[PDB]
Amino acid sequence: FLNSTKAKLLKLTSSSIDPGLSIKQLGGLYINFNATQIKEKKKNELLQKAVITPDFEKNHCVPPYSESKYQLQ
């Protein structure tokens, strides 16, 4: 897709025009055109925001699972 021209099919020049940046250097295209990177990031960011943390075994009392709104206020 990045370099697939019809001039490549019908040879008219020795070499083609080179763009400095490539798809592989970047993150890559968001969609597939034949027979995911944001999904791992969303999974990894969600994983970092978890109640189970380092020193979870260290704490003596587990924080309560749920609180009523009145107690939180």
Partner: protein
């Protein structure tokens, strides 16, 4: 525009406008230098199927002189010769660029190195 739409005119205006936004980009000059030489080959193939100055590669040579003046660098000067050697036609353009290497660019090690490697390229040993 060039490789798909086959319009050399549209690609020229896109390149010329690009240099006005980026006057000091060496990458833009090198690809613009390459593009005009690509246009010349299409015109040589156009003649065989059926003006003289562009067919000689003069229109690419105008890009050569101005780009050298704006960017006063040996590596950029040698680089334009690398694309120039790639095109078999208009050897004189390679000859003109090669001679300007030693005359204009001196007191720098790179130019003397290139001449040395150019000479490089049981009896055979």
């Amino acid at each position: 525009e060039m490789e798909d739409r086959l319009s050399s005119e549209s690609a020229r205006q896109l390149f010329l406008r690009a240099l006005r936004f980026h006057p000091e980009c060496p990458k833009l000059y090198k690809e613009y230098f390459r593009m005009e030489l690509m246009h010349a080959e299409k015109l040589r193939k156009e003649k065989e199927e059926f003006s003289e100055e562009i067919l000689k590669g003069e229109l690419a040579w105008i890009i050569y002189k101005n780009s050298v003046s704006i960017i006063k660098g040996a590596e950029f000067h040698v680089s334009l010769l690398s694309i120039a050697q790639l095109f078999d036609f208009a050897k004189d353009l390679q000859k003109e660029i090669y001679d300007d290497l030693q005359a204009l660019h001196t007191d720098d090690p790179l130019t003397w190195d290139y001449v040395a490697r150019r000479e490089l390229e049981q009896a055979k040993a």
